[PDB]
């Protein structure tokens, strides 16, 4: 049958024993935190407890990102339908369960950072596509650096008004101001090539994206052809990421839950054993008993008010 | 002074441009508010033609 483990103080030893008794538990022997090697204090268990809290953390990290809600379910027994299936009758193999969860956390962090890097780059280039298009076409000089244009997006035509007054007072009428309503507002100021920095200060201070060229893909002539090919690479690269995100969501949502319930039982196993010194001077008794295999289920369901179990 | 400032604003302001033209006419010398006092420096309002008011 399965070896079973109990812990208490010696105050309710008798009241616990009686109740243990009634569930067909056999060969109940009271022991101490020393005699069985597993149930002996080690620094090793203080680390092991930490490895389980790192798994717990990981579950939260993963659950947030996938957009799959918080899981509570809280089993450690085989009586329950999901408790039996998602928590194995055999004891813990700590090295393994950590090793499954560690890798996935790592692969997940790399993916997520990359997804974020792709998403901002794509949304900006698709936006400045149109802008550069307008400003170049408005030509035969703005495929070079002969005339200066300042393309830019602004989200208030009101603040643009304020900039026209400023520009005019201190920088004269060297601006030609054109505007189109976009999906933002496309503003354009057009200027000399030796006052370039002076207009920029003003633009910066009221917050606009007035740059002389708003994309860095430039390197084919005209600029817009490179920008369009880069944006074809961007668009599919986010998609591919999503496909990867999905594959990982299908494999591990159920698994996540099954680890979560496992871990509950492992936090319990280290406390039982006495995981550290605090635990020792709080629960001086650790007891031994044998529970038949079918019965093993109703036993871990039982949790007294101080008693927690591990079965093998 | 109040009458002077207004007549020049009305008359010449059009040359500077319609965008440039704001109404916040009037003058508060007490510290109850800091609106109503022209200067090109502030974004709050602007002079609409080259005009400086000199107070000795």
Question: Which technique was the structure solved with, according to the deposited record?
Answer: cryo-EM
A189 vs A167: CA distance, rounded Å? 10
Question: Which helix (H) or strand (E) element contains residue A259?
Answer: helix A223-273
Phi, psi of A3 (to 5 degrees): -70, 135
B46 vs A169: CA distance, rounded Å? 9
Contacting residues of A for B20, CB less than 8 Å apart? 165, 168
Q: Is the dihedral of CA A214, A217, A222, A227 positive or negative?
A: negative
A128 vs A234: CA distance, rounded Å? 14
Name the region of A298 (left: φ>0; alpha: ψ -120 to 50; beta: rest). Answer: alpha
Shortest CA gap A162–chain B (Å): 7
Phi, psi of A157 (to 5 degrees): -65, -20
- The residue among A162, A165, A189 with the most chain B CBs within 10 A of its CB, best to mutate, is A165
Q: What percentage of chain B's residues is helix, strand, coil (to nearest 5)?
A: 25, 5, 70
Structure tokens at A245: 């995100």
Asked if B49 reaches chain A (Cβ–Cβ under 8 Å), the answer is: no
Cβ–Cβ below 8 Å for B46 and A169: yes
A213 vs A196: CA distance, rounded Å? 12
Residue B14 to residues A103, A175, A177, Cα–Cα distance (Å): 71, 19, 19
Shortest CA gap A165–chain B (Å): 6
Phi, psi of A152 (to 5 degrees): -175, 150
Classify A290 as helix, strand or coil. Answer: strand
Nearest Cα to Cα of residue A121 among A226, A216, A220: A216
Do B56 and A185 meet the contact criterion of CB atoms below 8 Å apart? no
Tell the residue number behind the tokens 């009686």, with chain if given. A18
CB pairs under 8 A between A and B: 11
CB atoms under 10 Å from CB of B45, counted, come to 17
CA atoms lying within 13 Å on the CB side of residue B2: 7
Do A88 and A258 meet the contact criterion of CB atoms below 8 Å apart? no
Phi, psi of A191 (to 5 degrees): -150, 170
A182 vs A127: CA distance, rounded Å? 10
Asked if B40 reaches chain A (Cβ–Cβ under 8 Å), the answer is: yes
Asked if B20 reaches chain A (Cβ–Cβ under 8 Å), the answer is: yes
Pairing of strands A2-8, A26-30: unpaired
Tell the residue number behind the tokens 């999901």, with chain if given. A82
**What letter does residue A206 receive in the DSSP assignment?**
T
Shortest CA gap B20–chain A (Å): 6
Pairing of strands A285-291, A177-181: unpaired
Angstrom resolution of this structure: 8.3
């Amino acid at each position: 049958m399965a070896l079973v483990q109990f812990y208490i103080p010696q105050e309710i030893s008798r009241d616990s024993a009686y109740t243990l008794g009634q569930l067909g538990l056999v060969q109940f022997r009271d022991l101490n935190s020393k005699v069985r090697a597993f149930q002996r204090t080690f620094v090793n268990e203080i680390r092991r407890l930490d490895n389980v809290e790192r798994q717990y953390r990981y579950f939260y990290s993963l659950l947030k990102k996938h957009d799959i809600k918080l899981y509570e379910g809280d089993t450690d027994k085989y009586l329950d339908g999901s408790g039996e299936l998602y928590v194995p009758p055999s004891g813990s193999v700590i090295d393994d369960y950590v090793r499954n969860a560690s890798y996935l956390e790592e692969r997940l962090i790399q993916m997520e950072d990359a997804t974020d890097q792709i998403e901002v780059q794509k949304n900006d280039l698709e936006q400045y596509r149109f802008i550069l298009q307008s400003g170049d076409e408005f030509i035969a000089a703005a495929i070079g650096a002969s005339v200066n244009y300042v393309t830019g997006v602004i989200a208030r035509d009101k603040v643009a008004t304020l900039e026209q007054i400023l520009w005019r007072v201190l920088r004269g009428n060297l601006f030609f101001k054109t505007v189109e309503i976009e999906q933002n507002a496309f503003i354009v100021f057009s200027h000399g090539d030796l006052i370039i920095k002076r207009i920029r200060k003003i633009a910066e201070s009221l917050d606009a994206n007035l740059y002389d060229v708003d994309s860095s893909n430039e390197g084919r002539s005209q600029q817009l052809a490179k920008v369009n090919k880069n944006l074809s690479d961007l668009y599919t690269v986010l998609k591919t990421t999503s496909t990867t995100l999905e594959s990982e969501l299908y494999a591990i949502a159920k698994e996540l839950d099954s680890w979560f319930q496992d871990v509950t039982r492992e936090k319990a196993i280290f406390e039982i054993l006495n995981k550290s010194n605090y635990d020792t001077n709080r629960k001086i008794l650790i007891a031994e008993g044998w529970i038949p295999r079918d019965e093993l289920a109703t036993l871990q369901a039982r949790l007294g008010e101080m008693i927690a179990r591990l079965g093998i | 002074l109040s009458k002077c400032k207004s007549e020049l604003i009305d008359a010449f302001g059009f040359l500077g441009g319609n965008a440039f033209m704001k109404d916040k006419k009037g003058k508060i010398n007490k510290q109850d508010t800091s609106l109503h006092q022209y200067a090109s420096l502030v974004d709050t309002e602007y002079e609409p033609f080259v005009m400086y008011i000199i107070n000795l």
